[PDB]
Design an enzyme around this catalytic site. Structure first.
Site, mmCIF file in Angstrom:
data_model
loop_
_atom_site.group_PDB
_atom_site.id
_atom_site.type_symbol
_atom_site.label_atom_id
_atom_site.label_comp_id
_atom_site.label_asym_id
_atom_site.label_seq_id
_atom_site.Cartn_x
_atom_site.Cartn_y
_atom_site.Cartn_z
ATOM 1 N N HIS A 193 1.684 5.349 -1.813
ATOM 2 C CA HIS A 193 1.391 6.497 -2.654
ATOM 3 C C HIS A 193 2.709 7.106 -3.112
ATOM 4 O O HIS A 193 3.539 7.516 -2.286
ATOM 5 C CB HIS A 193 0.539 7.527 -1.884
ATOM 6 N N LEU A 194 2.898 7.144 -4.428
ATOM 7 C CA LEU A 194 4.112 7.720 -5.040
ATOM 8 C C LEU A 194 3.891 9.108 -5.650
ATOM 9 O O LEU A 194 4.851 9.765 -6.025
ATOM 10 C CB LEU A 194 4.679 6.768 -6.106
ATOM 11 N N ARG A 195 2.643 9.560 -5.724
ATOM 12 C CA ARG A 195 2.310 10.878 -6.290
ATOM 13 C C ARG A 195 2.767 10.942 -7.740
ATOM 14 O O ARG A 195 2.756 9.917 -8.422
ATOM 15 C CB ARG A 195 2.887 12.025 -5.433
ATOM 16 N N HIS A 225 -10.542 0.914 0.871
ATOM 17 C CA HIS A 225 -10.485 1.915 1.934
ATOM 18 C C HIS A 225 -11.832 1.852 2.658
ATOM 19 O O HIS A 225 -12.829 2.395 2.179
ATOM 20 C CB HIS A 225 -10.245 3.320 1.386
ATOM 21 N N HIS A 228 2.842 14.770 1.515
ATOM 22 C CA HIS A 228 2.362 16.093 1.136
ATOM 23 C C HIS A 228 3.460 17.068 1.514
ATOM 24 O O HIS A 228 4.131 16.856 2.525
ATOM 25 C CB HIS A 228 1.099 16.443 1.915
ATOM 26 N N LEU A 266 -5.623 9.201 7.309
ATOM 27 C CA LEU A 266 -6.849 8.435 7.320
ATOM 28 C C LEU A 266 -6.504 6.954 7.165
ATOM 29 O O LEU A 266 -5.447 6.622 6.617
ATOM 30 C CB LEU A 266 -7.780 8.919 6.209
ATOM 31 N N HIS A 314 -5.088 -0.574 5.380
ATOM 32 C CA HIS A 314 -4.751 0.225 6.582
ATOM 33 C C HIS A 314 -5.817 0.177 7.678
ATOM 34 O O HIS A 314 -6.489 1.175 7.950
ATOM 35 C CB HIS A 314 -4.421 1.688 6.199
ATOM 36 N N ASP A 354 1.207 2.777 3.615
ATOM 37 C CA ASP A 354 0.405 3.944 3.249
ATOM 38 C C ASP A 354 1.224 5.220 3.326
ATOM 39 O O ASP A 354 0.722 6.275 3.694
ATOM 40 C CB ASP A 354 -0.877 4.052 4.082
ATOM 41 N N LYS A 360 -8.620 -0.435 -6.601
ATOM 42 C CA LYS A 360 -8.801 0.195 -5.301
ATOM 43 C C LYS A 360 -10.168 0.859 -5.222
ATOM 44 O O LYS A 360 -10.562 1.602 -6.128
ATOM 45 C CB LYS A 360 -7.694 1.225 -5.055
ATOM 46 N N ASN A 393 -4.850 7.103 -6.769
ATOM 47 C CA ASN A 393 -5.544 8.360 -6.493
ATOM 48 C C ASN A 393 -4.719 9.603 -6.858
ATOM 49 O O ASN A 393 -4.478 10.480 -6.013
ATOM 50 C CB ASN A 393 -5.967 8.422 -5.022
ATOM 51 N N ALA A 408 -4.296 14.898 4.803
ATOM 52 C CA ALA A 408 -4.097 13.611 5.438
ATOM 53 C C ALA A 408 -3.011 12.767 4.741
ATOM 54 O O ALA A 408 -3.064 12.535 3.529
ATOM 55 C CB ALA A 408 -5.401 12.859 5.454
ATOM 56 N N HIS A 453 0.841 -1.196 0.000
ATOM 57 C CA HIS A 453 0.000 0.000 0.000
ATOM 58 C C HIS A 453 0.885 1.260 0.000
ATOM 59 O O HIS A 453 1.358 1.689 1.044
ATOM 60 C CB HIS A 453 -0.918 -0.005 1.226
HETATM 61 N N1 LIG Z 1 -4.197 7.810 4.352
HETATM 62 C C1 LIG Z 1 -4.129 9.117 4.142
HETATM 63 O O1 LIG Z 1 -4.308 9.852 5.107
HETATM 64 N N2 LIG Z 1 -3.893 9.633 2.925
HETATM 65 C C2 LIG Z 1 -3.761 8.920 1.660
HETATM 66 C C3 LIG Z 1 -5.110 8.369 1.185
HETATM 67 C C4 LIG Z 1 -5.579 7.039 1.775
HETATM 68 O O2 LIG Z 1 -4.807 6.032 1.912
HETATM 69 O O3 LIG Z 1 -6.790 6.982 2.108
HETATM 70 C C5 LIG Z 1 -3.262 9.876 0.585
HETATM 71 O O4 LIG Z 1 -3.192 9.476 -0.608
HETATM 72 O O5 LIG Z 1 -2.959 11.068 0.892
HETATM 73 ZN ZN LIG Z 2 -7.033 4.838 2.285
HETATM 74 ZN ZN LIG Z 3 -3.472 4.975 0.819
#
Ligand SMILES: NC(=O)N[C@@H](CC(=O)O)C(=O)O
Ligand SMILES: [Zn+2]
Ligand SMILES: [Zn+2]
Ligand SMILES: O=C1C[C@@H](C(=O)O)NC(=O)N1
Ligand SMILES: [Zn+2]
Ligand SMILES: [Zn+2]
Lengths: 343, 343
Positions: free
Chosen positions: A15-17, A136, A251, A219, A174, A247, A99, A41, A263, A13
């Site tokens: 996020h690489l943006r 999620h 940011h 989150l 998560h 996760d 997802k 996302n 978040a 899980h």
């Molecule tokens: N977990 C988070 O607080 N943020 C995640 C989104 C997610 O995993 O729901 C994100 O992409 O910023």
């Molecule tokens: Zn999530």
């Molecule tokens: Zn996530």
């Protein structure tokens, strides 16, 4: 002094943006993990094979030579998504999973799913073909207290969904509650979960006592201690359908530190060592490798990695900040010490 | 355009800070309120008659010409405080009341209280001379969940204290729970409470859903909606031992929107109109004047104000921020359209 040698881990899980943020953050993952589930996302979200291929290549471009890292791509489920698009991507080895973001539940979720009912054909196609569903799991109605949204999802959405598609493979992503931990522990072989380092290490007190700490704001929201203790017991039990998913969700500093902080914890640099510390504290290091390097592959029907890394129990101070093109990025545990570091 | 005329209100719980910040924020209070209870949590805290006299003068220096405003001073209770100093301040009219902040064994004896038991001599002196005790009713133990800390205080500190000191007048400051609303409702004539505008208008969802909002971060922490509704019901009931106390608690923008944001809402500019909005929504405007202008005076044994103030139901915009010497101050409801404003 003490050294743990483990099979190289994966991140189920992540996020690489995109763009410049992606260039900065991928090396922290690719230097450690053999593979990672790259969440979809983005803005706009990854909902087509074409977008996934291009995004995958942008990720590959940003991976330093010599790192053997493979991104496993995901599809962002939408109400109107064509089942054929999902399946085409799955068949081509593009989408490893899809997802499910409930609409407006989280980061870049305004295009998310409105009802399980609206996406039945897609989910039936996933069940048919053996494509895992990553969830999620939170309800979103405005009047439901934020701390109850996970538990309330289990009974209102997750259980009905799984009863309706009995062969669907699902990862409860998560998890943050005793409610989800119990649900997963008592589930069948078709149900799994990931757990972050922050939900093992902390509870809501750490985010709110003595000051408000946006870098712990993520989150699903950090819960009461009883929930944290339930997650710790779940991983320490040796239960084999829970596995590493950071996760890591970066940011820029001033998007965290603002009148409305985003978040997500940027925990990729520190996650593995942090997990080590938790398993050690729970006297469950005999289960650590499986969590990091075996349980995920097993659930996903993928081989385990054939290389090994070493963690050493030498105290590593975490950087206060990481440079970005504009602004800085604040790591999870910034300025802090981690008990275990990668050799 | 609807008009709401009331006797000039008072603010029974206020933070004015010191130096340049004091100069900036005092006018927002003094233009509207006849009197205010000025809390003593300066650095260092106000714990002597001489400090309180000097501080009162600095406050008076900052009141714009023409404003009829009288600060009512308080003593910060500490382990080392001489009950003779407290009584002398009370007898000389310097200390209107004394403020008890949460106990902590690690607190320096000159800056706070280690336990209620440790300061019985001073509390007995207050009971003796009829000096009101203002209580920030939270327990601080690291093992207690932040959302439980007010309720835990009632059980473990408030009730036994009021049992040991039956003649002591006590204000349960800024109550935030149904627990406290019930306790106060069911108490005797020696027990009162203040309620802030934020705790009537919002609950923890407003601080945490869709982003983390440090300008809604304050102590005691915003609670779940069932607690908000109990507070709204209490003030709307006409119960006459609850009264206006803003807990206006300003911090510079950079201190709010940081990696560890300070607790406190700067609500002095917008509190009165916000309370009007709440009473209107509760169909309880018949009890609005008493809350703002009568109940506090009756409990403190002071006269009700003889001049009047008018609110008009005309929509107005709250400033985005207020200039400080260095940095800015973000008001409660910054940038929002507000329903009631002062004529
Ligand atoms: N977990 C988070 O607080 N943020 C995640 C989104 C997610 O995993 O729901 C994100 O992409 O910023
Ligand atoms: Zn999530
Ligand atoms: Zn996530
Ligand atoms: O108890 C307190 C103190 C106040 C302050 O900042 O002085 N801020 C708060 O939010 N609560
Ligand atoms: Zn207080
Ligand atoms: Zn206060």
């Amino acid at each position: 002094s003490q050294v743990l040698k483990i099979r190289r881990p994966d991140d189920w899980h992540l996020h690489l943006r995109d763009g410049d943020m992606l260039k900065t953050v991928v090396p922290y993952t690719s230097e450690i993990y053999g593979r990672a589930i790259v969440m979809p996302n983005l803005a706009p979200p990854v909902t087509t094979v074409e977008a996934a291929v291009a995004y995958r290549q942008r990720i590959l471009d940003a991976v330093p030579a010599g790192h053997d890292f493979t991104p496993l791509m995901t599809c962002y489920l939408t109400d109107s998504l064509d089942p054929n698009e999902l399946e085409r991507g799955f068949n081509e080895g593009v989408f490893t999973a899809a997802k499910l973001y409930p609409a407006n539940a989280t980061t870049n979720s305004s295009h998310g799913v409105t009802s399980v009912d609206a996406i039945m054909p897609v989910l039936e196609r996933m069940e048919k073909i053996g494509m895992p569903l990553l969830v999620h799991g939170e309800v979103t109605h405005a009047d439901i207290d934020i701390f109850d949204r996970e538990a309330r999802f289990i009974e209102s959405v997750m259980e009905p969904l799984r009863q309706r598609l009995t062969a669907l493979k699902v990862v409860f992503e998560h998890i943050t509650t005793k409610d989800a931990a119990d649900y997963v522990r008592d589930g069948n072989e078709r149900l799994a979960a990931t757990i972050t380092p922050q939900h093992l290490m902390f509870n809501r007190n750490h985010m709110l006592v003595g000051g408000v700490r946006p870098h712990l704001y993520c989150l699903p929201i950090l819960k009461r201690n009883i929930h944290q203790q339930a997650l710790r017991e779940l991983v320490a039990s040796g239960f084999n359908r829970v596995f590493l998913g950071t996760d890591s969700a970066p940011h820029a500093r001033h998007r965290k530190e603002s009148s409305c902080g985003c978040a997500g914890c940027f925990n990729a640099p520190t996650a593995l060592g942090s997990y080590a510390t938790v398993f050690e504290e729970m006297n469950a290091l005999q289960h650590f490798e499986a969590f990091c390097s075996v349980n995920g592959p097993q659930f996903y029907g993928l081989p385990v990695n054939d290389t090994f890394i070493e963690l050493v129990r030498e105290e590593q101070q975490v950087a206060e900040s990481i440079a970005l093109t504009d602004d800085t990025l604040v790591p999870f545990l910034a300025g802090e010490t981690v008990r275990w570091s990668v050799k």
